[PDB]
């Protein structure tokens, strides 16, 4: 029933959510590729395959200064999204400054970081 789950993975593209007070909240598209070092995020990359089918990669990105509620929630929401997608998504943990080349490659400007973030839920 979660509204963002209902939007997840319906078209090829890139969807980014930030954990905010124990919820998934869309990131404004203008900000894509910039990440607050104080926060945790969930990213769903959807690719249209040759057959027309959809491929899913879920990445949860953990800022060096994110709080434990945020990193824990990002991990749990990742599992729940994968389950919603009938287990088809491959899950990837991304730590600030050590992200996979696949994850970096989603952003034409590359990955950048910013001080601060949304307040912890704890």
């Amino acid at each position: 029933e979660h509204p963002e789950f209902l939007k997840a993975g319906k078209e090829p593209g890139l969807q980014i959510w930030r954990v905010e007070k124990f919820d998934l909240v869309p990131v404004p598209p203008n900000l894509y590729g910039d990440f607050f070092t104080g926060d945790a995020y969930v990213i769903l990359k959807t690719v249209q395959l040759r057959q027309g089918q959809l491929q899913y990669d879920l990445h949860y990105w953990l800022g060096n200064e994110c709080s434990q509620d945020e990193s824990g929630a990002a991990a749990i929401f990742t599992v729940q999204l994968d389950d919603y997608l009938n287990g088809r998504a491959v899950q990837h943990r991304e730590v600030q400054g050590f992200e996979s080349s696949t994850f970096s490659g989603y952003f034409k400007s590359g990955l950048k970081y910013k001080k601060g973030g949304v307040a912890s839920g704890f």
């Binding site: 945790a40 990002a74 991990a75």
Partner: peptide, 29 residues
């Protein structure tokens, strides 16, 4: 405990007062 560490995959060694377990977990389960 795995979730509290910000992970969906790992092996947890949970040693308490009465029991210790090693629990492999993959993609949440």
């Amino acid at each position: 405990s795995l979730y509290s560490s910000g992970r969906t995959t790992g092996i947890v060694l949970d040693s308490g007062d009465g029991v210790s377990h090693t629990v492999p977990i993959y993609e949440g389960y």
